[PDB]
């Protein structure tokens, strides 16, 4: 037939070119406006079609309908038309091959609507001369409109949007469209420009909001070369039948060769690796063969609905349909879980979904049939409200909490009022660019360049930050409020090839030609980090800056089934058909995972521990079983939670938390004690905690949200502190009781020196890579020239020499004094997680055990009888117990609010009779904490308000350099956020890695890789403004202090 099936553009497979036809796919958006319904000028390439922009180019404004007396054809902006049979005996028609569209008869012409959209298109203007009907408007069910106005001689001159926006089209004497201008409330802004070759084919397309592109054509009127005009281009060569055989981009990117045969298309790279398609007579892809092997197969209904998918290992996903509706009723996963759907009879709109656990959700619909909330499985309704224009003005939860929105006369959102009656106010330029935002008495403003990109930001503090974009919209330079410049450079495809710090040091990147994945990083000291890719683009080996290597192997479907490190340790993985990890094999044994029908973990079994979980209804966890204890969460209410810990000398601990309708803790209650009240500001920051007639804490914040003061005590000595900040928001000074400390920083915000009363206490220097290593003094003098081996691995630190393992772990530490004999500290790493495993100091050994999540469970020393056990409530401890000679010394129950300690209870046991009795069981004592921003506890207070413990004096990077005060036994054991102190070794325990304070570094390389950061052994850039709470990736403690160009 003289037709081609319509495809939805998500069912098409591309290389470089549509594999099924050898046809170039180009589709570019040039304008985008409007608030209620969108006004979008989009153009696409279809060589044998015409419209605005001349031969070959067609666009959203030139859609039309044709009617051959009883059949109607709609010419959409895709490569094919829609066909409908509409006799004079019928009001509406549907075609099973594109069942989303319905065509209905109109007053004059036809009306086309897509099921899941509110917008309908009216082809109701006769073109004077099958019969051609022009597009005349779009209309919402809300009677919003977008009107197309034609002059005499049937040119489109204007497009009017009922909100306000309004476009004028302009033509030259040859009728060629040359410009589109926005002509709206005395505006004259030019929105796009077009230029043509002498033959009238489109030569250029300059778009204010988008890109400037150029086009060249071969002698057969087919595209030969498009370019950015600066560094990007792709080149195309064609066969005698119009099909594309070769493509090459700039820089050697995307090199493809295509071979065509009837039913089969194979595409090959310059290396000879070949992908193979198969497709059926409807141009639906049936098999894909990848170059490493592996065959994926698809099977279709007679109307081209996908019914079955088989992955190359045999995972089979099946579907079933409601005969001709095109509506899916069952989806069966490869694990056998069945999902079920049902639809309304009169109109094919979803009335219910059932999941494999027999929970049912019911969608709800307003008048005009637009969604209006849902009924949850519990029977609890959520509702929505809409103004006369269809904009959501109210949303409501079954608790009665509600969120409210208000709209300008141009239907722009101008005020958002949230569930806690905090308000945000917005402001707009005449061109609808977001000009202003008022959030909490802080006012933000922005200015824009001629391409509608942010030029200047004007912060609440009256500071100016400047942005410079290239013509393509890549942020080439950022200038912060100190005038330091951060710069980054872009290559052939807006891939960044280099970036330069404010100190001026430069980094470089290299990309894979076939896939544009990152394959190399060059250090400012010339060291290199590298990936090697498979034929399928999988990473099969990576190599570290120091030259450590890892190797991987994969299965047919793409899962990773083996890892080999450089110590010859082979880790293996087995997966279920849903790609969940199901077994882990290690030199130390198997670990087994078990799941339910829905993907919820029920049991992890491991060489030395077992975890169990139970869930209740809303996928809250209600029980956990761990080694050493249990947790039982009650949840009596939507805004309450009660936790009980049972451990065992049987012990129990209870707490209750209450929440302020927006998720923030506002009260804490410990069983035997009067409650603690937490106050919240309009930004949700904690401004104070108090116990009635007792402890009170008060805190102040700047308009940039940084903490500027703390005061605490028996309000009616405590702590009394102040902070000062730079204009780039680095901390410059801190003071307590007048003892001011001063920090000075280089052009990276790294502390050069610490002065405390004009005396210099500490100073530091940094190398070209940012490692906090070169001459430094905190407690001893560290020299810079013997600090590192080959790749930021430690060589000499004072009188200690370090030896490293073949796998890049630290293996020994040697105190080579030359006056004393050998002192050796030994570490015994395992393989599952580079867990420390064991340690031998100058004498007595110590051993550690871990859970199945990487969370330490024990710490034992058999020689002296010391054991420490831990119970965990998530990413932070819940209970700690400490034993010697088989009896308790201490127990700590701890409550956290984020990474910041809020309260602590402690019982202290001691035998006094020297008889087999656990004597003098003491009384629980509650302490309330005051903490620094980066998570270090500063002081602890009695509920009555008396201070009972105070932090010793401390170095920038954590070294203790004062003495212990009163009550050293009440020290919680916490350092920066996420870390615990090990006094036997002087190491700070992060979850996945161990930190050495004396060297500012971790003992082992990053568990993830370059995702964690470019610096594999560095802890953090600045201990006073960053935290690293898991061992994986550092983050800013305050928002608005983040680097906007990236790092």
Residue numbers in the entry: 272 to 287, 290 to 402, 409 to 927, 943 to 1010, 1027 to 1357
Copied sentences from the primary study:
One broad family of bacterial polymorphic toxins gathers multidomain proteins with a modular organization, comprising a C-terminal toxin domain fused to a N-terminal domain that adapts to the delivery apparatus. Tre23 inhibits protein synthesis through ADP-ribosylation of helix 44 of the ribosomal 23 S RNA, hence preventing protein elongation by blocking the GTPase-associated center.
In the high-resolution cryo-EM densities obtained, we could build de novo an atomic model of Rhs1Shell from amino acids (aa) 272 to 1357. It is composed of an Immunoglobulin-like (Ig-like) domain (336–421) preceded by a small extended domain sealing it to the Rhs1 β-barrel. The β-barrel and the two plugs define a central cavity of ~28,000 Å3 in volume. In this cavity, densities are visible but not well resolved, confirming that the C-terminal toxin domain is encapsulated into the Rhs1 β-barrel but suggesting that it is highly flexible and/or partially unfolded.
